[PDB]
Design a protein around this ligand. Sequence first.
Ligand code: BCL
Ligand code: BCL
Ligand code: BCL
Ligand code: BCL
Ligand code: BCL
Ligand code: BCL
Ligand code: G2O
Ligand code: G2O
Ligand code: SF4
Ligand code: SF4
Ligand code: SF4
Ligand SMILES: [Ca+2]
Ligand SMILES: [Ca+2]
Lengths: 98, 645, 630
Amino acid sequence: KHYFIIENLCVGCGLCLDKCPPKVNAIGYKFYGDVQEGGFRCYIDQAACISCSACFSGDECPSGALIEVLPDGEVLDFSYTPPERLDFDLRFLHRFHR
Amino acid sequence: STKWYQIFDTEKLDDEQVVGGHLALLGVLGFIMGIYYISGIQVFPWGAPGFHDNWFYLTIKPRMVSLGIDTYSTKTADLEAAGARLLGWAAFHFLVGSVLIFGGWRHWTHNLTNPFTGRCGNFRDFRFLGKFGDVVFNGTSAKSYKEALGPHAVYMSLLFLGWGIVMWAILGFAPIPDFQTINSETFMSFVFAVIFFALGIYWWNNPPNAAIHLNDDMKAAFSVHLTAIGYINIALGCIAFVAFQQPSFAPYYKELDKLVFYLYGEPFNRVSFNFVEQAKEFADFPAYAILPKSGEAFGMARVVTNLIVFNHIICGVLYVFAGVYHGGQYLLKIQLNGMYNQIKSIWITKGRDQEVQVKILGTVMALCFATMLSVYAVIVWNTICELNIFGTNITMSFYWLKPLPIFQWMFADPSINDWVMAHVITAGSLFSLIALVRIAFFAHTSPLWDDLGLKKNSYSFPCLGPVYGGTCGVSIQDQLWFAMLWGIKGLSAVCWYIDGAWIASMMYGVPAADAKAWDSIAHLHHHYTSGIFYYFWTETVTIFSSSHLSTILMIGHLVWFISFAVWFEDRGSRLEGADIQTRTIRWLGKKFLNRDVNFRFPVLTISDSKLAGTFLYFGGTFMLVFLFLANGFYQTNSPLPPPVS
Amino acid sequence: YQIFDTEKLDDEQVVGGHLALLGVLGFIMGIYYISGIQVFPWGAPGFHDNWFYLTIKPRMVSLGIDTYSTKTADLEAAGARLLGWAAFHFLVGSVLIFGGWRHWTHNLTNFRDFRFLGKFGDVVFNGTSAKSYKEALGPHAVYMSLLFLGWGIVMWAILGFAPIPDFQTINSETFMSFVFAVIFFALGIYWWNNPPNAAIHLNDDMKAAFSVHLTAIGYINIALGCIAFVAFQQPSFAPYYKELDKLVFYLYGEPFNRVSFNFVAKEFADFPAYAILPKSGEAFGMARVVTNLIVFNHIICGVLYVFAGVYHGGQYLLKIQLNGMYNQIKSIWITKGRDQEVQVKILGTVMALCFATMLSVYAVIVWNTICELNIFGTNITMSFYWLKPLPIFQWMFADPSINDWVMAHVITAGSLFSLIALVRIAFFAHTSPLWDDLGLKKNSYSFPCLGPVYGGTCGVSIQDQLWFAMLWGIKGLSAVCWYIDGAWIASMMYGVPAADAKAWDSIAHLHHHYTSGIFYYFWTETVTIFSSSHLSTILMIGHLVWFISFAVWFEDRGSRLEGADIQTRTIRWLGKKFLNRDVNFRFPVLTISDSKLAGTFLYFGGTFMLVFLFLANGFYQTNSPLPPPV
Ligand code: BCL
Ligand code: BCL
Ligand code: BCL
Ligand code: BCL
Ligand code: BCL
Ligand code: BCL
Ligand code: G2O
Ligand code: G2O
Ligand code: SF4
Ligand code: SF4
Ligand code: SF4
Ligand SMILES: [Ca+2]
Ligand SMILES: [Ca+2]
């Protein structure tokens, strides 16, 4: 398990804190500068954090900083990312959308 | 996080579950209608007086008059007949509603067993009736909403035919094609039965395909139908306002002004501090009895018309907003699920390209800004000219600006007021449409959140934090709240126009000179009640006169400025204040309790704080608008003279 | 909005700014003086009247600069005196601005050690300056003694008033100015022989001294407002105020002499076209109006000064908490809040007492309303009409009644309600018990959000708590305004057309008919406001400001940010379409701290822009009580 958070990507919203049991207190705010410019980020204490996976399974991260490393080493920004699609629009010639 | 407003969410409900809920609601609605019908009994069939003219029944009344029920009679015998018919139809409604509630419970439990024949009816497969279902469909719609539209239209045709039959037999209205008289609604009911039977059989043999809804119907179909029926309700309100003003409805609505009403909460005859009932103002009426309010002065016809029209209009606007919000919820669901790229229909693929979303929202914003700036500049310039500040008389105001003669057909007295009303309605429609489009297109990622790497991962997330100095209220729920607040202005314009008010200026009729000379220079046979700001002063005379309306006034105001507490950016302050409250309540320890005070003071979540704030905001605002429409019409057909010849 | 931060300015910079501001105050004082000259010595018609000048006028009448006399020659002489004094104010203010520029810009000659009026500047202060603030309290008091002595000698010499000590005349002001000069001299000499000991404002102290002085001045202003309300009501001041009822006043923006549309007709004869119509002072009660304006200005300015002093003290507290100076202050004004357990006790006690008294008074008010409107079948005999101030407390109030009891309880409850936020600023500036439990501290005077966590954390910072304190004190200030304008604050609809609404006067046997209840007061003041176009314009502008405040108040800044991105894209696309490659005009959306700043600014601004109309429409309170409805 050993979940990590990328402070470069994190914007400091703290929904991980709400998704963490109060008895563990693994998520914590770290302040860097002005709050309105991004300021504080969030960090996980690996020793305290013991494989709950509530944070990632909640899939609440807007920034995708909440990452999950696997025993084989693959990293996940989101539980299920939408597939990448070759996008190109449809316009019927004789229909009203032309 | 499943809250108490998520337990009835459709995601947990099946088709049979919602069928049962709709039937329970129909039965409860029938019970409420029985309550109202009983509440309309003016004289009891026992030989005794009746109920004191509830607003619910005062709204219901003209429709009942259209039927054989509820004669507009001061004659006691005919009024007793009216009460008898009302009570009988109320009992019939009670019985039918009880059976409907029973059916709704059966469909809620998924327990469909006929007592007479011990068989279980499958929801997925059945015949609608013993022979009729085999005659028409030969089976059941195969658990797909598109295949059900046919049978639904057939059932609606059956209901129309039944309504025609009921009018023909019980209410005694023979269908004739004379649309001015009442006895054509049954003929049109039969015509609609034929038309909708044809449409139902066509849609059963050829089901229309919009494959977006079928998969998660519980939200997609809900949103589409809710927005469509909201627009239908707006259209019904418009049609009602036009028709109730027609001479054809006049025998059923203008006569409402002829008769007086004794309303609940209408001021009573006031006794003195020493009334020896063994001094009393208005001694002819008994002590603490309601003084009659004359319909002619109250304008009860237009008051009831306005109540009906604005009820349907606001319900339609709210239904449109909720349809957009639930469609945004479904779109967010499919965006997180990856199905947004897989919908394959015009209603999504056109909005799939973010640049098309940008173009549409920018066009809406430009139209809203232009129309709003134009109409607002007109309004404030009219106000400036009528108050004469900066040395401008009303000759410089927009009194010349009438609607175009080609477009003048749909107004009683063409004036700047109708122009500003139309422009304000369009501007407010586009103003709310800005947020509705934001919900529609930006459920997951806005172009800003595309540029700045964030995405919306929930329908009720508060915000994304103080990053970039913002992120407040980007959730589709919060955009819905903003849309509702923006449409409050449009609904207010609707209410003030239907009640009668000068929307083209702010202070029309005030003791200022050019405010009074507006009618003189405008050549209007209608004297609008007053301007935007003077509307309160002119229409609160009755609201203050009536104790009941004043009570509603106070309660709505309290509700609004309690909404203030949860609307503002103060949730953290309230949380720390609640922690202090909890600490002092724990300080009730050593006040001789010997009881562990396990009561943490609760503070609502931001996603819940905005919910409560909008609910209380809308509730207070329109609890007060009810008084706006219940003060009276008070429009006299008399032009104002100029203060100076 | 932080460009004149105390840490950016030295002491001499502060001196220069204050001197420039006193000079501009003299300049605007001259502006008002020349704005009130009724008839010029030229003989031409002069300025009609201004609320500025109608506020100033009683003082000029007391001083003899201007008179209430009814003679054109007398008014011309008064205008000549007014112009002379305005010229004096202009010149002295110009000199003061010159000093302000010579002190803001350090160009003289010794600010660390100088000599002040050296001939006797060696007699007082040993021929040396005040090295520090503790040493400066002395010379400041002696300077104020010089100011009082100057007022006394000017009043005797130029205004020609006697030193008679009887307290029913301006000669009392002369005698007491001399006495105050003596007293200030004694205080200053003691302070020079012994500087004070409050060391917290002797270290880096600009913000700290400023905060404590602003709070003291705000409470002094509230006291001055109460004192002025009592004194302006006293018969001894009546010659200078009650004559405002006996005179007519032509004010700008009043209903003009209404012209016709075929006019080369007019409403009133012999008054020319578009002429400000006369008003009788008895109808407006202009004495009560002027004292209301002055007293409420002082009261609100004192409230705002107290709030800002608490806010700046919180700023300094956060500063000394961040660098560790908080834990080594020997002044008791910090030791009583350093324990962080007395803080919880104090705030909880204030919250609980505020809750109890506010709930009691609100219940009383709503029960009065219910007994008024006969809701749930409640007669007027079921109300709190027995409830009055006790005879011991009755000397405080004239015409004792439930109105006065509710006013006192409401103002105390509002004071405590704002004090909740003030105490939150005072104690939880860096550490809060919740924020100590959550493991997150705070580091800036304006951190608005700290993210959505534990449900959300909006508005915890010191600045946001100042905004909330102002918001909650709006109710107390409204209570003050509505009591000084004569509103019946005990109930919600008094004197309204309804059942048992007039009956109050027949129940309480009042000798003073109050204007209206809470909700009927708007109606009964707007009946007079709507006549005036000026008050109507202020009404609409104030409401406009108020509701535009809500765009930044609500939790909506992020929606505005994405909408501004959309607006920027739209503008760029369109400006690149009809015009060649013009790329500019990013839509600026205020940050959440600045959003709260602007929201409070607009809210307070509009609200009291309208309270000014409450206090300027007129008194309209009659001594004849309402009859029983029977
Ligand atoms: C004009 C007709 C409208 C419509 C009007 C209503 C109304 C009105 C109600 C519902 C209700 C429900 N509807 Mg519907 N609804 C429409 C279209 C749909 C479609 C669809 C086409 O896909 C679906 C799937 C649903 C599904 C549902 C469920 C969420 C719920 C019934 C099941 C249940 O047992 O609830 C479990 C719970 C109950 C049945 C009762 C719970 C207690 C009370 C009565 C809830 C009242 C809520 C609120 C005050 C209603 C106010 C209306 C406003 C005054 C304008 N509606 C059409 C287009 N529907 C009810 C619901 O619960 O709303 C939340 C409800 O109030
Ligand atoms: C249905 C749920 C409740 C109920 C709640 C209500 C409500 C709510 C109202 C009435 C009212 C009426 N009720 Mg009922 N009532 C019920 C059961 C019944 C039954 C029955 C045997 O089931 C009967 C005969 C009646 C009888 C009647 C009439 C006395 C009266 C006018 C009917 C009419 O105009 O319909 C018109 C019939 C049609 C238009 C055709 C049938 C319906 C069609 C198929 C559906 C589309 C039309 C829809 C209603 C409006 C949408 C228009 C859009 C443009 C699409 N009630 C049950 C228990 N009753 C009305 C009232 O008292 O008026 C003051 C009223 O508004
Ligand atoms: C016209 C009949 C119905 C309608 C039927 C549907 C259907 C069907 C679907 C939606 C769906 C959606 N509806 Mg809809 N909806 C209507 C009214 C609205 C209004 C509104 C206030 O006018 C709004 C804001 C919405 C909002 C939304 C979104 C949540 C969503 C589409 C997102 C998207 O990418 O759109 C992209 C934008 C468009 C394709 C716009 C162009 C529309 C059509 C296809 C093209 C011709 C019309 C032309 C532009 C306008 C002039 C001619 C008209 C005849 C007046 N509905 C009316 C009431 N709506 C979908 C969803 O997923 O629901 C959960 C869905 O399945
Ligand atoms: C310094 C700034 C400006 C200026 C701006 C103003 C302003 C602003 C106002 C006046 C007003 C007046 N000014 Mg001036 N005026 C200036 C210079 C002068 C000069 C001069 C010597 O040149 C003179 C003769 C005057 C004369 C006058 C009077 C015509 C009038 C009433 C004064 C009076 O009550 O004072 C009495 C003097 C004192 C009591 C002196 C001591 C001041 C005390 C210390 C002030 C604070 C008291 C308070 C309770 C707090 C105490 C706290 C601590 C306990 C110590 N001014 C310069 C140019 N002038 C007033 C007005 O027009 O009234 C309608 C007014 O408010
Ligand atoms: C006597 C009661 C108050 C007091 C009253 C004021 C007031 C009131 C102000 C200051 C101002 C300042 N005070 Mg102070 N001051 C006190 C004691 C202190 C002490 C101290 C204890 O040693 C300190 C360190 C300070 C520090 C300071 C500075 C931050 C600042 C002066 C710099 C300058 O540029 O301002 C000059 C700045 C201005 C020119 C801009 C603001 C004023 C307005 C906008 C312009 C004046 C013209 C006016 C609008 C014309 C009237 C028009 C008519 C209404 C129609 N004050 C006590 C506590 N002080 C001023 C400042 O701006 O603070 C930020 C200011 O306005
Ligand atoms: C009476 C004199 C002044 C006063 C003098 C000071 C001084 C001096 C300082 C402050 C400072 C502060 N002031 Mg103060 N302050 C006053 C009014 C207020 C009010 C208010 C009542 O609205 C508030 C909220 C504040 C707010 C604040 C805080 C920002 C800060 C104190 C934090 C703390 O730990 O305090 C804990 C303290 C208390 C809980 C109260 C201590 C009271 C002491 C012990 C006196 C005896 C109390 C007794 C009941 C009085 C009986 C009468 C006797 C004649 C003495 N001031 C009045 C106007 N204040 C400090 C700061 O840093 O300023 C920048 C500071 O050094
Ligand atoms: C009359 C007063 C108001 C405006 C003027 C205005 C302007 C405006 N606002 Mg607003 N608003 C409220 C009042 C006003 N909001 C209230 C009381 C609330 C409390 C709920 C509120 C709330 C939100 C939220 C939550 C969001 C917005 C936005 C958004 C816009 C983006 C583009 C747009 O709507 O174009 C449509 C163009 C208009 C809305 C403005 C046209 C001018 C008109 C003729 C009135 C002129 C008033 C005045 C004279 C101008 C100042 C000159 C002088 C007095 C110094 C945008 C132009 C947001 C976005 O940027 O995206 C939509 C967003 O997220 N709001
Ligand atoms: C009638 C209207 C209001 C209240 C009732 C009230 C109650 C209340 N609020 Mg509020 N509020 C606004 C209106 C009302 N806020 C507005 C318009 C804003 C926009 C700025 C606003 C904002 C903030 C912030 C930012 C904070 C608070 C708090 C805080 C309290 C904590 C203890 C205290 O102050 O008790 C003093 C207050 C009481 C005595 C309230 C209880 C009886 C009452 C006399 C009247 C009874 C009215 C009745 C309950 C209504 C329905 C009755 C029946 C149907 C159930 C606390 C009891 C906060 C804290 O917990 O600490 C102070 C905090 O941080 N607010
Ligand atoms: S995995 Fe468990 S312990 Fe670790 S941060 Fe998430 S909730 Fe806390
Ligand atoms: S949810 Fe994402 S953005 Fe929010 S605190 Fe956790 S890692 Fe940071
Ligand atoms: S003010 Fe409140 S809603 Fe807005 S970003 Fe900050 S925490 Fe979120
Ligand atoms: Ca009305
Ligand atoms: Ca007034």
